[PDB]
């Protein structure tokens, strides 16, 4: 699962952090991007775990 | 927390098992025992976590 934001959220020992904090994807105006295997979304288009 | 019964319940990695399965305390008829720092109990005298 994702962990995001200006938090110093320490990992639990049961958890494992695979990588250093990757930059959140930025999408410039008048630009586009495509991602395979997208997360599902509802009518609110909220992420659905 | 306790884990008891004829189960092959494997430990989770986050969990740690301090010791080998100690025998459940046996209390013979016409005998008695006393334990300091008893677990709390309700009106049902069920264990209260």
Swiss-Prot record, chains A, B:
Signal peptide positions (record): none
Modifications made to the protein after synthesis: Phosphorylated on Tyr residues after EGF stimulation.
Superkingdom in the source lineage: Eukaryota
Cell compartment(s), UniProt: Cytoplasm; Nucleus
Its job: Required for normal vault structure. Vaults are multi-subunit structures that may act as scaffolds for proteins involved in signal transduction. Vaults may also play a role in nucleo-cytoplasmic transport. Down-regulates IFNG-mediated STAT1 signaling and subsequent activation of JAK. Down-regulates SRC activity and signaling through MAP kinases.
Quaternary assembly: The vault ribonucleoprotein particle is a huge (400 A x 670 A) cage structure of 12.9 MDa. It consists of a dimer of half-vaults, with each half-vault comprising 39 identical major vault protein (MVP) chains, PARP4 and one or more vault RNAs (vRNAs). Interacts with TEP1. Interacts with PTEN and activated MAPK1. The phosphorylated protein interacts with the SH2 domains of PTPN11 and SRC. Interacts with APEX1. May interact with ZNF540.
Domain text: MVP 3 mediates interaction with PTEN.
Protein name (Swiss-Prot/TrEMBL): Major vault protein
Organismal lineage: Eukaryota, Metazoa, Chordata, Craniata, Vertebrata
Residues of the full protein shown: 27 to 75 of 861
